[PDB]
Amino acid sequence: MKLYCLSGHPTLPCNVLKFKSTTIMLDCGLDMTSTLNFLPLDSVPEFCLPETELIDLSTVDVILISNYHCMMALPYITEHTGFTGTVYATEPTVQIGRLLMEELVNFIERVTWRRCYTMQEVNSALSKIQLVGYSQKIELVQVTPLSSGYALGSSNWIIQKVSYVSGSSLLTHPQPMDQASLKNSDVLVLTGLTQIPTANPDGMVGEFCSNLALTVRNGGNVLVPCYPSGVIYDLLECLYQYIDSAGLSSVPLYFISPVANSSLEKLKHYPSIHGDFSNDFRQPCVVFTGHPSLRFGDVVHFMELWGKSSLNTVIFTEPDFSYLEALAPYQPLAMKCIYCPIDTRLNFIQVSKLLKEVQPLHVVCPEQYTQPPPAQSHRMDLMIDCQPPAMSYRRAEVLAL
């Protein structure tokens, strides 16, 4: 048990697990943290990648995946390298991840780090994947996915004993976060916690709907940079409830996106602005569109048209891109900017109650969790309170376990 760690990011991990004879590489998603060093669509916005210098991929056997938010690096791992193993994942996961992959490439061919990939790779990558359901035991050790409740297809993986928890929620619609299924283990890898540990989600949901309805009630336009799948659904089930309860009347909801029709499986879902959108475009309106990073996509067009008036408003909900640095290339600015990070993950008051119920022996988390946050360095509760102390790791490290 010598856990090679290829990426240091706490939310988009990359961990290789060495065993007696098997090797497992779980949760191999990209790091969009770098695509906003560049300028919007003077170069090509280039992406990061897990540090493959630690070990070759021709030795990796299997590649597990929990959820779609960390899969976009699957091309670089199974196509450009000599990877010749199988890949397991869940049915509603790959159905969604395929959708996000088509959006990204569509945005970029419109006109160590590596350039972006093309439609050729993703099809061959999304081919050699074997799909499973919850509790369907798979052999090799005997890995099996469970229910985390974070996203639609989002599974924790218990290897056999070593448990693995990444990006799990407890505030729910999906299948509940099971807890009895992952106790009595030797070690327990725990990654993917919330990144806004202080503010509750329910506060920020009421903060999204309130800044929205405050603008459209005053004759203004609201731009919401979001993904086509993920948090956008919880915004809409809350926005529908808000409109019915608070009484917002007759405001369009233009969900324009290159891949939007298959994205739902009075929200009009036009495919692009070049088309019948410019004709049926009534203001004041709301447009869930673009890419969160603001470095490409349709939002770059909207961000320029409306950005010259104090009545309009842009609201950020992706708790991954710092909205202050993702917005600098547009200054000077007159349009209000609001940060309303909706994040539904395991809070620190929630993770401890888990441990005092699951009761593992050893736990392992990145450096950013065994230390209080960089803002509230004094707050000692915003940290994994476990006994015995948790074995931390960093980027490009080899633990002993």
Binding site: T198, G203, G206, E207, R217, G247, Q376, H378
Partner: protein
């Protein structure tokens, strides 16, 4: 009594004891037992028991049938007690061994019915009615009932157990006004204080608490000096047996200069040091409420009431018993601060306040517990760093602190306090993660701090420009109770500062009067009522949204609407308009048409209140009446006179009576005064001004409903 009820008594007594009919209704008995008290309290009782010799056979059957219900027994015991309250009836009820048979082992005491707490509560409340004269005093001593009450003061029913201790206190104080009864009681109490289990000690300390306070005669003074040695020896065990009962004794003793004149203040002073951090508070505040007290004691009282706050103020950048509790756990920390802020708030409005009352230091200690709760404090120790992890996001401590910070504004102080107070208040409003119950208190604290400042100076207008952008964000919250709370703030603020050129410049400059008007169509009915009231106020001040397109929008709600809350909120607005004076006849005529056609009793009642206001401004006289008949008032007042709601009929009765008076000191006045005289009003007023059950609550109709069963009528939900 009266002839209608009298002739119905013999049948009543027959059905109550008969074993074939179903058991009588428990509610009916209670409503019947209350009737007898009314009769006997104003007349003699022995005259009654002869004039109607059927009640005795009911009492006499109680110890013969051996199969009475469980609830007819209870009725009879309380009935035998309420009759034998006068000495004449107490003896007259003994020829045949009736009273010593009911409250003795022959009666419902020795049988297999002393198991239902209804009979026991009836036995105790039976004695308490008769124990009011010396003849009964001898009855309680000899046959033995004080020995029985001692066993009832341990019962498993708080309703019985606590009514027994209220009987010992009644027997004791009656015995002396030592005598026979008193000497046995004080012995059992004094023997209970020396017990080993808590329930026995609590039973004693509750008999003592009622003694001191209900009787200050100098025999009580002798009792305190004899028991003080044992009472003081209670603060020596590992757990003090009954702390909240112990504390309540010291306070009822202390608030009497008699008892306080040497061993009292020595125990009190020692209690403050040995009681835990759950009762030390309630005792330390009781001290500060008193005028007479050793100054060395109060200085120790106040200093143990401020101790939890003093620990927070030092563990943040600007006592082991306390520092342990605030860190022991989250429940105990939030527990100790919520009680301390409640106590220290019941203390401020008092004239016997401690002095000097620290104002500047308390506020700074209250503001620094709102930031810890909010989450933006700054530690200065490891106990301050542990405090941020506990108090952060605790709604119970944030509600307690926000009520206190609102109280700490009625004492005049420097403006440095106000700037520091509003600064932390405004942070609670412009913040996510404040619950709808915290936003209701932040909005109530912000209002007392504004209306208590030393036009509008140089600093208030700046806070306003910072504020109204936060009010716009709250009128759009996704909860009806927050959009409602922000419309009662905008109403009260505009009710005071409505005529200040500064407030009208910061209001209209923002988008508040436009959001306040798009809420006349909120789906929730409680927010239409608040929006209508705010527009009514905002338009009396001349601050309409940039004047009669409102009266057209309000009059639409009064007619075409679903709920009652907006409609009765519209009527209060139209009345305030007419009385203030914001074509008058056409106004009153249009409104009194939608009132009379309405279906709610509150909208019609305010209609006549809108008429009174208009009637007064009118009452040369011939047109005054002609105008008064043009609006249709007489059509309104007469229809409401014979109405299905007695509260609506009184308002119209009081209206015409006020109209029949003014029209005397001064169609035609002559003819209309006939129509006013033709119908009776004083007879109408006397009928309307009575309850709506003067027939169904009468003793006549109460009696008939008990002996005239035999229909379909069991108990279900309302």
């Amino acid at each position: 009594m009266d002839p209608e009820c009298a002739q119905l008594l013999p049948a009543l007594c027959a059905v109550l004891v008969d074993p074939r009919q179903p058991v009588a209704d428990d509610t009916c008995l209670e409503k019947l037992l209350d009737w007898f008290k009314t009769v006997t309290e104003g007349e003699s009782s022995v005259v009654l028991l002869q004039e109607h010799p059927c009640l005795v056979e009911l009492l006499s059957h109680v110890l013969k049938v051996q199969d009475l219900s469980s609830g007819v027994l209870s009725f009879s015991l309380r009935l035998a007690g309420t009759f034998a309250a006068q000495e004449n009836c107490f003896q007259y009820l003994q020829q045949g061994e009736l009273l010593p048979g009911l409250f003795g082992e022959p009666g419902p005491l020795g049988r297999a019915t002393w198991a239902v707490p209804t009979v026991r509560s009836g036995w105790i409340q039976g004695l308490r009615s008769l124990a009011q004269h010396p003849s009964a005093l001898r009855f309680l001593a000899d046959h033995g009932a004080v020995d029985t009450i001692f066993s009832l003061q341990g019962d498993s029913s708080l309703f019985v157990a606590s009514a027994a201790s209220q009987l010992l206190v009644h027997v004791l104080a009656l015995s002396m006004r030592w005598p026979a009864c008193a000497q046995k009681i004080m012995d059992h109490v004094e023997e209970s204080l020396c017990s080993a289990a808590t329930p026995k000690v609590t039973q004693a300390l509750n008999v003592l608490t009622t003694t001191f306070g209900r009787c200050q005669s100098p025999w009580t003074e002798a009792l305190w000096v004899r028991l003080s040695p044992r009472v003081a020896c209670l603060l020596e065990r590992d757990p003090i047996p009954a702390a909240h009962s112990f504390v309540d004794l010291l306070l009822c003793v202390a608030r009497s200069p008699v008892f306080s004149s040497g061993s009292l203040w020595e125990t009190v002073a020692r209690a403050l040091s040995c009681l835990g951090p759950t009762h030390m508070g309630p005792l330390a505040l009781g001290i500060l409420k008193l005028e007479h007290c050793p100054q060395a004691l109060r200085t120790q009282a106040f200093q143990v009431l401020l101790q939890p706050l003093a620990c927070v103020l030092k563990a943040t950048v600007q006592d082991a018993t306390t520092v342990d509790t605030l860190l022991a756990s989250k429940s105990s920390c939030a527990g100790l601060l919520c009680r301390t802020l409640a106590h220290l708030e019941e203390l401020q409005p008092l004239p016997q306040r401690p002095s000097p009352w620290p104002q500047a230091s308390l506020l700074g200690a209250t503001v620094t517990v709102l930031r810890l709760c909010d989450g933006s404090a700054a530690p200065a120790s490891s106990v301050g760093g542990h405090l941020c992890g506990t108090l952060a996001g605790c709604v119970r401590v944030q509600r307690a602190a926000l009520d206190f910070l609102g109280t700490l504004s009625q004492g005049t102080g420097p403006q440095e306090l106000v700037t520091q107070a509003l600064a932390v208040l405004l942070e609670c409003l412009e913040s996510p993660g404040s619950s709808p119950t915290v936003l209701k208190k932040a909005f109530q604290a912000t209002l007392r701090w504004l209306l208590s400042s030393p036009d509008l100076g140089p600093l208030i207008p700046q806070f306003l420009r910072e504020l109204f952008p936060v009010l716009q964000k709250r009128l759009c919250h996704p909860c009806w109770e927050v959009r409602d709370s922000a419309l009662e703030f905008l109403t009260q603020l505009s009710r005071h500062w409505g005529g200040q050129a500064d407030f009208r410049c910061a209001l209209l400059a923002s988008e508040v009067p436009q959001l306040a008007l798009q809420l006349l169509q909120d789906p929730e009915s409680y927010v239409r009522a608040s929006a209508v009231t705010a527009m009514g106020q905002l338009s009396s001040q001349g601050l309409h949204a940039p004047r009669q397109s409102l009266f057209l929008e309000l009059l639409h709600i009064l007619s075409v609407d679903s709920e009652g809350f907006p409609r009765r909120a519209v009527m209060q607005v139209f009345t305030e308009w007419l009385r203030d004076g914001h074509d008058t006849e056409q106004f009153v005529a249009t409104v009194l048409q939608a009132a009379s056609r309405d279906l709610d009793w509150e909208v019609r009642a305010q209609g006549l209140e809108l008429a009174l206001v208009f009637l007064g401004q009118t009452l040369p006289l011939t047109e005054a009446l002609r105008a008064l008949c043009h609006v249709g008032l007489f059509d309104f007042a007469f229809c409401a006179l014979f109405d299905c709601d007695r509260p609506v009929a009184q308002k119209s009765c009081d209206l015409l009576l006020f109209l029949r008076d003014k029209i005397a000191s001064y169609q035609e006045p002559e003819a209309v005064l006939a129509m006013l005289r033709s119908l009776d009003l004083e007879g109408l007023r006397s009928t309307l001004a009575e309850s709506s059950d003067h027939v169904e609550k009468s003793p006549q109709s109460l009696l008939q409903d008990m002996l005239a069963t035999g229909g379909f009528l069991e108990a279900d939900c309302y």
